[PDB]
Structure 1
Amino acid sequence: RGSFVEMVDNLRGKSGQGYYVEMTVGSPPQTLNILVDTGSSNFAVGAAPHPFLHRYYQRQLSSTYRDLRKGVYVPYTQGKWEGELGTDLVSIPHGPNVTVRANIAAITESDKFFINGSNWEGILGLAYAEIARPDDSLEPFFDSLVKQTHVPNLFSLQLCGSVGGSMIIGGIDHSLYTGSLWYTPIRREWYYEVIIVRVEINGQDLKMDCKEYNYDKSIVDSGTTNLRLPKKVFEAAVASIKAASSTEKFPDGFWLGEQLVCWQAGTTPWNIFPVISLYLMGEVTNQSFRITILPQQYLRPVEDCYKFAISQSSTGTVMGAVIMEGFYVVFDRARKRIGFAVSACHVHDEFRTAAVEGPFVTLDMEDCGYN
């Protein structure tokens, strides 16, 4: 409890490609790099020699493998994968010193799924059975972990945004954050769904009906890059960001993520860009708190050229790696809540730092949840 030195720094990544943890599958152990994803619930790994893959799960080499004689087809907004289900023994070398029998989808065919030049070979879905494929009876990895061991039912993520971070499995490490943790309820256990009750650009309320902020949900997703905002909120959001930053100008396609914008080295105008604060539902009736992110988070370097990493959505708000890089995030599954604290490692400047602040008084927070 509170100290987990062995798990500190167990995440690696490359800008834009996601954060991955080393895992082993089967006996003898086959080592793989696995994308950490709080936005999905399948443990799926490459199982065949796709060209983009450094390595892949070779089921034939494992004595502990058990076929479930069952297929799964998984389409996404763009790209898909399909696979064959089974179970085998899984470990996390730089995680808890346990071994569990987990479901694994062996990916036999995929499209627009693996990334050319990336260093991961599979994906660890850390969300709940409700959104598992093909259905809620396929038990996600973290459930199997907690069912079969003494590992406490919670994990936490410090994503530092070439890149690194920590996934503390079964606890919290106090060195990873400064100040206090503030908790927001998990509304329903499927995605890590939360409720945003208020949005400020540079301390300026959007004055939108709060239901709009959560239309049709808001979730915390380490497998998404952007802060994704519902269409109507996004319009409001950029309009207010465009205005707060009207001190300089950029093409209209830039705000739509259809082009990059570039400045010279040692000289990006951070300060003409506003802070963004999301107030989240608190643990107590009529009590909220707010998280504050910097343009450092929503203006992401591409290779000085940057992409605007706030985008519109038809699936609701997504607090991707943009938000998460500001914070140490606690997925407290045992108490159905998400904790936020200022990350000890977040990227800032000398004028502004990311922040988690409370308590604030906010009424009718229940009306902010879409049904």
Structure 2
Amino acid sequence: RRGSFVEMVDNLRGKSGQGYYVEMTVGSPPQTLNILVDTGSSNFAVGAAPHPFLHRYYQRQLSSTYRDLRKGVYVPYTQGAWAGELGTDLVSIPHGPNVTVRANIAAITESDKFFINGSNWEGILGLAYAEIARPDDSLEPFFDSLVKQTHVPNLFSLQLCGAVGGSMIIGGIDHSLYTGSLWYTPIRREWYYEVIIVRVEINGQDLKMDCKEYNYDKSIVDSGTTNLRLPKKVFEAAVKSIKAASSTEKFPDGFWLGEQLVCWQAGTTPWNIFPVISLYLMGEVTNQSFRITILPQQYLRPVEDVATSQDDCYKFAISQSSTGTVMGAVIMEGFYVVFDRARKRIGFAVSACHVHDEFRTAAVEGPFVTLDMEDCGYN
């Protein structure tokens, strides 16, 4: 219940729900920048040239400790891409661990639909493993450098508080960030933070899909992705069930596709008419699983108000994917997520800051009995 990690609490910020970022200071003399926390990629990169959406950027000529690697780097994402130049420099996180390391850094010189207007972040911290780093797995990711060069335990945890703030505890866990117990699911393979979903329920009702469909291709935990993205067949079945569950009100088809949004008079959003969604994850013991449950407050996201108006507009943030399940911010904002790399597992617990109402709350419950969970994974 105590807190030796107090200085790392509340070290994350967000602007109009456009990405959670932490301050990172690079080079010498110090150059501090706002960096997006992304567990869905593995490259540490910072804007290094003027751009319409950037307030500031990394100026390598001003850093005496900058070391040019003489190699270009290109990183394409689901949304956007950028080109840059590799090098290494001293990096520290003011509100993170009390250490300084020399890490690889990609200086972003050109980009397309990457930076987001008004987001206040100027770079990205890829927290996933080396296998997915660009140009290749020989480019050591920032966290790997942190663990190799210092005594910091191989583990970090994220509390993303939606509507924007949060905490990234590096090297441990802070008990003030969650309630109840922490439940762990294994990290299937160390590339993306891959996990295995064994069952899906909408308002306690089993979607009844073969679990292989839930992980077709893969299922990952990705703080760099806004939505809960699901494979085509899963998406369709989920929307069908969600619509049936919230039949007390009808919405245009475009709403469920994220193309149309619906607004309610400030403070009147009928959260109660929307169902809860539960994802069962493989547990750490044979045939044992647990489930995490989110509320409509997590999958219905606010859209930057017109100008402090009397209308709360929302977008349905569950969408389709062709590269597996992506448990993005809509999932993470309901919990305190522990990325226990040391023990190859990811923990989930109810977040002390998740958005809810006086009738329902996000939950993490278990254990449950689920047979043949191993077969749910894709090979």
Which shifted more, 23-32 or 264-273?
264-273
Q: CA deviation at 1:49?
A: 1.1
CA, structure 1 residues 220+86, in 2 after alignment: closer, same or farther (shift >3 Å)? Answer: same
Q: Is the 8 A contact 2:16 2:119 kept in 1?
A: no
C-alpha contact (below 8 Å) 1:177/1:344 kept by paired residues: yes
How far apart are 1:2 and its partner, in Å?
A: 5.9
Query: Which residue does 1:215 correspond to in 2?
Result: 216
Are 1:340 and 2:348 an aligned pair? Answer: yes
Deviations 1:333-353 (A, max 9, x none): 000000000001110001101
Pairwise CA distance, 1:125:
0.3
3-state SS of 1:334 partner: coil
Contact 1:3 1:174 in 2 (8 A): no
Q: Which runs of 5+ in 1 are unaligned?
A: none
- Poorly superposed stretches of 4+, deviation over 2 Å: 75-79
Deviation of 1:261 after TM superposition, in Å, equals 1.0
Q: Distance in 2 between matches of 1:78 and 1:175?
A: 34
Deviation at 1:15, TM superposition (A): 2.8
Q: How far is 1:192 from its partner?
A: 0.4
Shift of 1:134: 0.6
Distance 1:77 1:345, change over 3 A: closer
CA contact (8 A) 2:299 2:317 kept: yes
- Note if contact 1:217-1:317 (Cα within 8 Å) is conserved in structure 2: yes
> TM-score w.r.t. structure 1 length?
0.99
The CA deviation at 1:162 is 7.2
d(CA) in 2 for partners of 1:78, 1:157: 22
Contact 1:329 1:339 in 2 (8 A): yes
Which runs of 5 or more structure 2 residues have no equivalent in the other structure? 305-311
Which deviates more, 139-148 or 255-264?
A: 255-264
Tell me the equivalent position of 1:358.
366
For this pair of structures, how many residues does the alignment match?
A: 371
Alpha-carbon distance, 1:126 to partner:
0.3
RMSD: 1.0
Q: Which moved more, 1:48-57 or 1:274-283?
A: 48-57
Q: Would the aligned equivalents of 1:182 and 1:339 in 2 still touch at CA under 8 Å?
A: yes
Q: CA deviation at 1:80?
A: 1.6
1:77 and 1:318 map into 2 onto residues whose CA distance is: 11
* Separation in structure 1 between the aligned mates of residue 189 and residue 5 of structure 2, nearest angstrom: 29
Q: Percent identity, aligned pairs only?
A: 99
Structure 1 position 3, deviation (Å)? 3.2
**What are the Cα deviations for residues 138-172 of structure 1, in whole angstroms up to 9, with x where unaligned?**
00000000000000000000000070000000000
Task: Give, in whole Å, the separation in 2 of the partners of 1:140 and 1:326.
Answer: 27
CA–CA distance in structure 2, aligned partners of residues 73 and 148 of structure 1:
26
Cα deviation, residue 77, structure 1: 3.5
CA distance change for structure 1 residues 228 and 326 in 2, over 3 Å: closer, same or farther?
Answer: same
Distance 1:162 1:260, change over 3 A: closer
Indicate the SS of the match to 1:193.
Answer: coil
Q: Does the 8 A contact of 2:74 with 2:84 survive in 1? A: yes
Output one character per residue of 1:2-46: Cα deviation in whole Å (capped at 9) or x when no partner: 630000000000233100000100011100000000000000000
| Distance (whole Å) between structure 2 residues aligned to residue 280 and residue 147 of structure 1 | 31
Contact 2:83 2:111 in 1 (8 A): yes
**Contact in 1 for aligned 2:163/2:302 (Cα 8 Å):** no
Q: CA deviation at 1:78?
A: 4.0
After superposition, what is the alpha-carbon deviation per residue over 1:271-317, rounded to whole angstroms, capped at 9, x for unaligned? 11001000000000000000010000001111211000000110111
**Contact preservation (8 Å) 1:10, 1:94:** yes
Please give the alpha-carbon distance, in whole angstroms, between the structure 2 residues aligned to 1:151 and 1:266: 44
Cα distance in 1, alignment partners of residues 80 and 315 from structure 2: 22
Q: Residue 132 of structure 1: CA displacement?
A: 0.3
Task: Provide the C-alpha distance between the structure 2 equivalents of 1:34 and 1:96, rounded to a whole number of angstroms.
Answer: 15
Describe the shift of the 1:12–1:251 C-alpha distance in structure 2 as closer, same or farther (beyond 3 A).
same
SS in 1 for 2:265: coil
